[PDB]
Each structure stands twice: as structure tokens, then as C-alpha cells.
Design a protein around this ligand. Structure first.
Ligand SMILES: Nc1nc2c(ncn2[C@@H]2O[C@H](COP(=O)(O)OP(=O)(O)O)[C@@H](O)[C@H]2O)c(=O)[nH]1
Lengths: 12, 299
């Protein structure tokens, strides 16, 4: 349920 | 002004924050610097240790067999005169220097040489860390860091974001109302044994092309230009970009790297990238560049 900011933006 | 500071670990984020404190907040008093003495010693110690351990793996001999005993004593002893003596002699050895010159093959603090070459000053019983010493220190920043300051009638809220994981909710409050984003890149990472420079490009890519930053100023800080200029003299850019056909001058190589990052922008006609070449530890350079960044925010 926690993620880096990169994967957060890379979300579709 | 809500400012976001992003970039891979060790690209220079916390150092810039320190510069903001120095330039717009009253700087580092002599007593504040005294608090960094332990970190300076710790950084110095781990640096020389990293170089010696590398000598073993890379199979590099000392220039003088006598150093073998100093190396042994180093590990046992870890700032006493005793330890300083062991470090000065090891740092001076040609074999150790041989390994140091091959740092691109293992993990070594950027400031390694800075401290080791200044050991005499650092080792003194009444040593007091200078601002440059503090700026040079390496301490991993875990968790978001914030700093406030007023400049040209603007109240800045600067957030230094590392690489920790978090709930989507916290990221939302983090990335909202962002006036500008400064992405830091460690130019000197180009030849480090995917490519560290390419990891960085991947990061920048997601920032630059994200729809929700369409009205956010994207600023690119091509940092560590000073370390880069020194490395480019002996380590070719091809190690990082194998297709590169230019010369190995600081100027061409730097322009190329800049071009590689700016090319990632899929809306060149709509979105502009504000690129700067920086030396995060050089407060005079960070001041000049930040002044320029502030003007672009005013405009
Ligand atoms: N020579 C040099 N060292 C730098 C520069 N920018 C940062 N550093 C050093 O490299 C490391 C990056 O650290 P900091 O800024 O601590 O961490 P970051 O926020 O994770 O990237 C620190 O040891 C800094 O003192 C630069 O432009 N030149």
C-alpha cells in the first residue's frame, strides 16, 4: 500500500 | 512558493537545502558547524576504509609493504593522533591512490578526496568544521525534509523528497500546489560501473511529461559539474552513452548530457525545461543559479 514517488506517477 | 526538490540519492538535494539555509536563512554559525565534526570524521573514516577494502577485491598491492600493517591497524582503531597517522600514510601510498583512481569500480563518497587531502586540518585537537566542510558531509536523508525562507518578497516552502515509499494519499498532498520542481542529476555518475545516469533520465522522464505539472516550472539541475569536469578528462562519456561521437571536453560532453535529458520532453513546443549546471557545494554558484530560478518564477 506504500510506494515511491516514481511508481506513484508512473501509475495508469 | 511550494518548491519540490527531486533526484536520485546522492545527486545533491540535501546540500542545496543547506545552501538555502546559508544564503537566505543566516547560514551556519560556528557552533552549528561544531555539530558536524563527528560526521566529518565518520565520512573520512568510511572513505579510507572503502578504498582499502576495494584494494583487496580488485587485487591492488600497496606501493610499500609497510602499509599492510597500517591497513590492519586502521580496522582495529576504528579522531586520535594514532588513527590520523594511519590514515595519512595510507592515503599517501601509491597503491592506495591507484585504487582511489579506480573508484568508479566501487562505492566511494564524493567528498573522499576533499577530506583525506585536508586530514592535517581535520585531525587537529581543536578542529572546527568550516561551512565547506559541512556542505561536503554525507548523511542519508530519510523522509521528506522542509525548509522555509523569504526571498524577493516570496515565501518559499521547499520540500526535499527522497526515495522512501508512502501511501498514495501522502504523495497527493506532496505533489499538489507545486509551483516548481528542481530535479537534481549527479553528472559525475555517468561512468559509474542499468546505467545510473539512465536511471536518472527515467526519473526525469516521468516528471517532465506528467500532465499535472503542465503549469509547473520544470528545472533541471545538472549537478556535480566540478567532479564531472575532472572525471571527463580521463573517463570517456561513451561509458555512459556508447553511441556518443563527440569529443571528451567538459563543454561538449556536458552539452550532450543536457541534450539527452531535454530530449525526453515530449512537448518541446508547449513545455520548457530550465536547465542549469551546478556545483551544489559552491554557495556562490547556487546563489547565482537560485536567483535565476527565482526570476523565472516571478516571470
Ligand atoms: N564536489 C561536489 N560534491 C557535491 C556536489 N553536490 C553534492 N555534493 C556532495 O555529494 C553528496 C550528495 O549529498 P546530499 O546533497 O548529501 O545527498 P542527496 O540529497 O541524497 O543527493 C554529498 O556528500 C555532497 O557534499 C557538487 O556539485 N560537487
Amino acid at each position: 500500500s506504500r510506494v515511491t514517488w516514481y511508481d506513484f506517477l508512473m501509475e495508469d | 512558493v511550494k518548491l519540490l526538490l527531486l533526484g536520485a540519492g546522492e545527486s545533491g538535494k540535501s546540500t542545496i537545502v543547506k545552501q538555502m539555509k546559508i544564503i537566505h536563512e543566516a547560514g551556519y554559525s560556528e557552533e552549528e558547524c561544531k555539530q558536524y565534526k563527528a560526521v566529518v570524521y565518520s565520512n573520512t573514516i568510511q572513505s579510507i576504509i572503502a578504498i582499502i577494502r576495494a584494494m583487496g577485491r580488485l587485487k591492488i598491492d600497496f606501493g610499500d609493504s609497510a602499509r599492510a600493517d597500517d591497513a590492519r591497524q586502521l580496522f582495529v582503531l576504528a579522531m586520535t593522533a594514532e588513527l590520523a597517522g594511519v590514515i595519512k600514510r595510507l592515503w599517501k601510498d601509491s597503491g592506495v591512490q591507484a585504487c582511489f583512481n579506480r573508484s568508479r569500480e566501487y562505492q566511494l563518497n564524493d567528498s573522499a578526496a576533499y577530506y583525506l587531502n585536508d586530514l592535517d586540518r581535520i585531525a587537529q585537537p581543536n578542529y572546527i568544521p568550516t561551512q565547506q566542510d559541512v556542505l561536503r558531509t554525507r548523511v542519508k536523508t530519510t523522509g521528506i525534509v522542509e525548509t522555509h525562507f523569504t526571498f524577493k518578497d516570496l515565501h518559499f516552502k521547499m520540500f526535499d523528497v527522497g526515495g522512501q515509499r508512502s501511501e498514495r494519499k501522502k504523495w497527493i498532498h506532496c505533489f499538489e500546489g507545486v509551483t516548481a520542481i528542481i530535479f537534481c542529476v549527479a553528472l559525475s555518475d555517468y561512468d559509474l560501473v542499468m546505467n545510473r545516469m539512465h536511471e536518472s533520465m527515467k526519473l526525469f522522464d516521468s516528471i517532465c511529461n506528467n500532465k499535472w505539472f503542465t503549469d509547473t516550472s520544470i528545472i533541471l539541475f545538472l549537478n556535480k559539474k566540478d567532479l564531472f569536469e575532472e572525471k571527463i578528462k580521463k573517463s570517456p562519456l561513451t561509458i555512459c552513452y556508447p553511441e556518443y561521437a563527440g569529443s571528451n571536453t567538459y563543454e561538449e560532453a556536458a552539452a550532450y548530457i543536457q541534450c539527452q535529458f531535454e530530449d525526453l520532453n515530449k512537448r518541446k513546443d508547449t513545455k520548457e525545461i530550465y536547465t542549469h549546471f551546478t556545483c551544489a557545494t559552491d554557495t556562490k554558484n547556487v546563489q547565482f543559479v537560485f536567483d535565476a530560478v527565482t526570476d523565472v518564477i516571478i516571470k
